[PDB]
Design a protein around this ligand. Structure first.
Ligand code: HEM
Ligand SMILES: CC(=O)Nc1ccc2ccc3cccc4ccc1c2c34
Ligand SMILES: CC1(C)[C@@H]2CC[C@@]1(C)C(=O)C2
Ligand SMILES: [K+]
Ligand SMILES: [K+]
Length: 411
């Protein structure tokens, strides 16, 4: 409550009015045990203003409502991506391309990143995605149990990504640890250190692949043209770093929230079993209700936004997760309804940095749901297990022990 009682609170800057203070900690929200999305949505209760200042993590603004999150993501002139992670040290070290660049300079790099993860790449890979989902799920099916995070939610998206990037599967533990320190730091490695370690891994590979290219995403990037010239090794490195983080730490977390929900809700399962054709619309509703990303921007100048004086250099967290949980975007937002006429969300971001991997993500989710519900239509949480979530730039599920009767499973 005061800096005296919590040594991790920063002194309130003199431009912030006291009535705007709400000390939310994005890496450990006080309500976390109710679930991560629930923990974030306390920011939308009636006692909280649209725009609040937290003294946690160095002190920063949080926009709490979809309209303000959308406005701020649109207005890159005041809200710059140059420092898009909280705390300030992490935002300062973050130098990934195109995400750390404001329009119009992100353009050519966005162009090149799209060539390696966009829709034509997803369609070319769809057979491989179905192959891997089917193979993993058939291998779990007769067992009647799994640890979902490690038996499926990690290896399924990550192996697809390492296949796309032409990286060996035995490097997964090393890379996954690093990507995870960036989004959900345990406190033993700064963002800068995790990035430096990711860059040390990538640098020799990128050199090799500029000398002897393959057909993999890393060789395509490292040998691209941007801005009228060959991309440099360093630029390709700053792009590939971002690619790894999207490949290893996005869909991986989302699949656990979704499968946890399905394990906890037989009625929703039954609706997808009985009407498989509803799977794509159901995926979008899950992408809304179990949205999981929160990054932000930094103020380029003093700026009064919705009646609130923002100062240059002030950081603002713009939680992508919150737009679709906002009751002003969706009625009864904590309820999952696969037939919503309009699933309003900003789960994949908004504006000029809108997600390039979203098509890969949707295919992976859709394929996972269709293949899981076909082979293992009936499952549940391990009895007595209480599911814990974790919170950060990308939120996650600590463990998801599932069980089923093998007799109920199908080929
Ligand atoms: C459920 C899975 C995913 C979610 C929730 C998600 C979310 C997002 C969000 C919120 C942004 C914008 C961040 C900002 O404005 O600073 C974004 C951008 C991006 N994402 Fe996704 N993402 C997902 C999957 C992926 C995958 C699988 C990849 C690639 C393998 C990927 C690559 C990108 C890239 C390259 C950008 C930067 C686009 C730009 O700066 O122009 N993402 N992601
Ligand atoms: C190279 C370039 O045009 N930059 C572009 C940036 C981002 C894109 C995101 C999704 C896309 C789907 C289909 C065609 C696209 C063409 C161009 C795209 C682009 C495309
Ligand atoms: C916020 C993101 C999900 C987006 C893709 C990876 C991520 C952690 C970034 O750094 C940009
Ligand atoms: K930076
Ligand atoms: K409404």
């Amino acid at each position: 409550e005061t800096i005296q009682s919590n040594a991790n609170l920063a002194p309130l800057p003199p431009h912030v009015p006291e009535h705007l203070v709400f000390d939310f900690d994005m890496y450990n929200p006080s309500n976390l045990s109710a679930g991560v999305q629930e923990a974030w949505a306390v920011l939308q209760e009636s006692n909280v203003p649209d725009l609040v200042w937290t003294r946690s993590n160095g002190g920063h603004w949080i926009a709490t409502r979809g309209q303000l999150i959308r406005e701020a993501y649109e207005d890159y002139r005041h809200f710059s991506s140059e420092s898009p992670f909280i705390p300030r040290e992490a935002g300062e070290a973050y130098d990934f391309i195109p995400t750390s660049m404001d329009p119009p300079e992100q353009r050519q790099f966005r162009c090149l990143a799209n060539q390696v993860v966009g829709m034509p790449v997803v369609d070319k890979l769809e057979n491989r995605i179905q192959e891997l989902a089917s193979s993993l799920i058939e291998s779990l099916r007769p067992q009647g149990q799994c640890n979902f995070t490690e038996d499926y939610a990690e290896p399924f998206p990550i192996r697809i990504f390492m296949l796309l990037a032409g990286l060996p599967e035995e490097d997964i533990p090393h890379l996954k640890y690093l990507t995870d320190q960036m989004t959900r730091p345990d406190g033993s490695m700064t963002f800068a250190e995790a990035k430096e370690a990711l860059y040390d891994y990538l640098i020799p590979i990128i050199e090799q692949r500029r000398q002897k290219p393959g057909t993999d995403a890393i060789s395509i990037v490292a040998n691209g043209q941007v801005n009228g010239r060959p991309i440099t090794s360093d630029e390709a490195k700053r792009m590939c770093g971002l690619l790894l983080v999207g490949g290893l730490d996005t869909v991986v977390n989302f699949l656990s929230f979704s499968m946890e929900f399905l394990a906890k809700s037989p009625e929703h399962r039954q609706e997808l079993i009985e009407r498989p054709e509803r799977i794509p619309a159901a995926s979008e509703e899950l992408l809304r209700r179990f949205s999981l990303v929160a990054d932000g921007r930094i103020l380029t100048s003093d700026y009064e936004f919705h009646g609130v004086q923002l100062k240059k250099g002030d950081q603002i967290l713009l939680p992508q997760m919150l737009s679709g949980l906002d009751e002003r975007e969706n009625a009864a937002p904590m309820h999952v309804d696969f037939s919503r006429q309009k699933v309003s969300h900003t789960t994949f971001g908004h504006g000029s940095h809108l997600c390039l991997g979203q098509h890969l993500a949707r295919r992976e989710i859709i394929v996972t749901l269709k293949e899981w519900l076909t082979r293992i239509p009936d499952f549940s949480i391990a009895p007595g297990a209480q599911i814990q979530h974790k919170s950060g730039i990308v939120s996650g599920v600590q463990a998801l022990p599932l069980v089923w009767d093998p007799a109920t499973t199908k080929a």
